[PDB]
Design a protein around this ligand. Sequence first.
Ligand code: X3M
Ligand code: X3M
Ligand code: NAG
Ligand code: NAG
Ligand code: NA
Ligand code: NA
Ligand code: NA
Ligand code: NA
Lengths: 468, 468
Amino acid sequence: SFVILFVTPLLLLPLVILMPAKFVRCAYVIILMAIYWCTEVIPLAVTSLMPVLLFPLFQILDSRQVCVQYMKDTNMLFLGGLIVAVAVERWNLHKRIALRTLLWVGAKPARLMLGFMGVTALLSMWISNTATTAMMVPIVEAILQQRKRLCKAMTLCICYAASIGGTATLTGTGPNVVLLGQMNELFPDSKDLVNFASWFAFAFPNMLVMLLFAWLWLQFVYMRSKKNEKAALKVLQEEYRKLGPLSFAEINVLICFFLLVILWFSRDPETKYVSDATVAIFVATLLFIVPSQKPKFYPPPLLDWKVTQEKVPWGIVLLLGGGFALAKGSEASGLSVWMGKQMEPLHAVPPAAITLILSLLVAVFTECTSNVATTTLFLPIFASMSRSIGLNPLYIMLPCTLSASFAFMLPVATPPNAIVFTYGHLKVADMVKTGVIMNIIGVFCVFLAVNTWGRAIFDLDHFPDWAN
Amino acid sequence: SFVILFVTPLLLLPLVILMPAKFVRCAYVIILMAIYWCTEVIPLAVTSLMPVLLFPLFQILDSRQVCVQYMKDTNMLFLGGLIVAVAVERWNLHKRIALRTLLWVGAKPARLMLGFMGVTALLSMWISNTATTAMMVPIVEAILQQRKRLCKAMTLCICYAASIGGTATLTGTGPNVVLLGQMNELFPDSKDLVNFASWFAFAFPNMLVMLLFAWLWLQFVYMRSKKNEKAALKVLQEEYRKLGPLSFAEINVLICFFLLVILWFSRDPETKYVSDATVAIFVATLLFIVPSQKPKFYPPPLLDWKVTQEKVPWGIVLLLGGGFALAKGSEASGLSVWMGKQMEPLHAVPPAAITLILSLLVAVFTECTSNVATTTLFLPIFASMSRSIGLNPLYIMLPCTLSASFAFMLPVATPPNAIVFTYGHLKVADMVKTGVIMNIIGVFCVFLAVNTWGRAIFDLDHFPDWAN
Ligand SMILES: CC(C)(C)c1ccc(CC[C@@](O)(CC(=O)O)C(=O)O)cc1
Ligand SMILES: CC(C)(C)c1ccc(CC[C@@](O)(CC(=O)O)C(=O)O)cc1
Ligand SMILES: *[C@@H]1O[C@H](CO)[C@@H](O)[C@H](O)[C@H]1NC(C)=O
Ligand SMILES: *[C@@H]1O[C@H](CO)[C@@H](O)[C@H](O)[C@H]1NC(C)=O
Ligand code: NA
Ligand code: NA
Ligand code: NA
Ligand code: NA
């Protein structure tokens, strides 16, 4: 039942009030926040707000030293991305790109599945995986209403494509922002090593491989009659024409998005001040002053504030802050040092086995919790391991955060799967059967990526000095 | 027109790019953000996000040193207050307290006005002045539909009562939180001198005086037939019974609110860690696990997350951060020192005249802009003045922030007045005529308060050492 999850663990709080060793107190905080992460008896952001409420009582950190960790460059970056995504959503743009791509590739189940997967991934690279699948599934439903395995195939394709595309852009989804925050906190001498450009270079090639493998696996398991070609076009056309002409505002938001991309990349092809958060905020601001209509007086702009107050995941701006506060408390108390001293004997196990095992463990784990909690709970542990054995932490921290996005079964794993399920014929057993193999595929692809071309970018074959 | 406000000022940006003196650059940033404060061509939060976008370009602060100033104890305090206010709003509680008070005082225009003003003030002490007036005006409309001066009187009473009650609790409204943030930033050795208790002691007596004077002034200007007594009761009763019985959840939220009050006060009747933000977060968290219904299984709690994501002013969590970033940039660049050296000659003007003049200036100013922008623009200036002449900064910083809430004409001054106007018969001239006198009243009351009983609490007759 739901009662025990937050009444029995609290009963241990008087146990550890004295506990003349702060790292025990920080460990209890982390364990409690993890127990509340996996089961949502209490929402995620509320659990993120717990460190300010517990570190003081445990005499670890003051209230200010804890709260001033809840906003940093990473949160601003994610917030700017979210606002741009709101601008994209308000004007039905993505529903235009998608419905043009579908009419381009064709109306054939083999090609139609590829179109849906590719579109969903490309959108999810910037558009908050949940939202893009929420937008795309209705199109699939409309098509289907006009065997029993095509339905499952397409429904799974939406979610897998979203979860895979998300792990290409540093914004993408929470886990990558969490990685950036942990790198800035634990390893601050890494001024800018995981940027938008570096992460995009390391990860974008990977998601193409994962998408190809997923498409092959799906068309092998569920696909192993011209009406379904001549009656899906009659739906795509009649759901495309409803969008009207090119909608002048869409052009301006597209231009702003391209400017955002160009500024993110061109920046990194003397006392830098101008990190990517500045760019994201710049474009988010520009979105409020652009006309959105032909002046012929300045017509109503692209974005009001009501829209971006109603439609913005603000809780994921506190969740990452909770992660950062946890990292700060771990550094202050002495938990990271203890974990480092308790993981020396791993100096004999070869690093590749460590990376593979931990990636598989994280992939299994994230089918129960959310994909952000997994990272903010695991990454400090792997970072402490790496310092103590003589590795470059990125070796173990990149595949882990890529794997945390491998939620391919257990609808509870990530919202997209739940959204896909809500529509009917996607019995859960099918998800498990088709998702275990996809988790294996993702782990193999990630291992290949990190061991082949992620070593030249980050120099993972040497032990640096920003990890003392 | 709206075009010039954000295309001509930007044209000065290339002028000051070089400008081998950082304080000029910080001054330009502040002036631009002020110009965008007064006229809302670009929303307020977006302007608050500007420092991260401009200080880097001007080589004042990095992006992290700027963004890590956007969350602090004050923002958490205000956020907890906001969440509790959401819990109050979701269950129509305040509409129960109010409609019981109205039936208690009576149905007579003289007594009815007092009931409305007192209720609106008491609610606004915790409930985000805008929201309480939004809730209360419909009751007045319902009553009126069943001379032409009663309408104006009641409509003005709602807004004046809200704006006056807000300035009693440290949360209350933005200006007081801004004062707390500026005290923590500019004067950090003032560990805890303006708390909830101290501010409540200094300000709560003042708002009773202001409410009494406002009620007298209104009943003198607009009030200088038993049907209006026997047909407002027939409305209050029929709008009270619709609320049903005491609504078990209301009891629990009331208990949580009382616990919040008791924890805020009892705390201050060795290396403190437990500032009021901890209490606010504690109660905000408790609001998510309390049943909200009789278990008889844990029924749905008082607060979900959808409700507190839809209904929470998140932008005022970035606005205060913008204020703090401005203060940090002023300290870093060298603008505060310059302003201190340019305000020595005021060492001859007696302090009381300074306080009165500045309070009146701020009261006039805040009839154009918002009440938060005024404080975050003025308070650093007054703080720099005080250090250089030999005063206790609170002397000039308390009345200024109390006066910034004196928006009693010019609907654009603060949202409550606009809400009141939207209902009809409140011609603007009436607002000016009845508001100039009320601004004078507020200034006089504030001067009396600070000069009589605000000197013992804060020791304003000596120059401390937390102001070097
Ligand atoms: C509680 C709120 C509403 C603030 C919230 C928190 C976390 C997410 C996760 C979004 C995700 O990153 C998926 C993932 O991380 O599992 C994606 O892009 O779909 C979404 C919303
Ligand atoms: C832009 C958003 C929506 C974030 C926003 C900003 C500022 C306020 C002010 C609230 C005020 O403090 C009045 C006052 O300060 O003028 C009160 O309590 O009514 C309200 C909302
Ligand atoms: C930094 O490096 C020094 C030299 O090995 C090491 O002793 C010290 O513990 C390290 N400090 C941190 C904060 O990593
Ligand atoms: C603190 O006090 C010293 C002594 O007067 C003064 O010289 C110095 O400028 C002050 N520093 C700050 C940061 O106020
Ligand atoms: Na995404
Ligand atoms: Na998951
Ligand atoms: Na208020
Ligand atoms: Na105002």
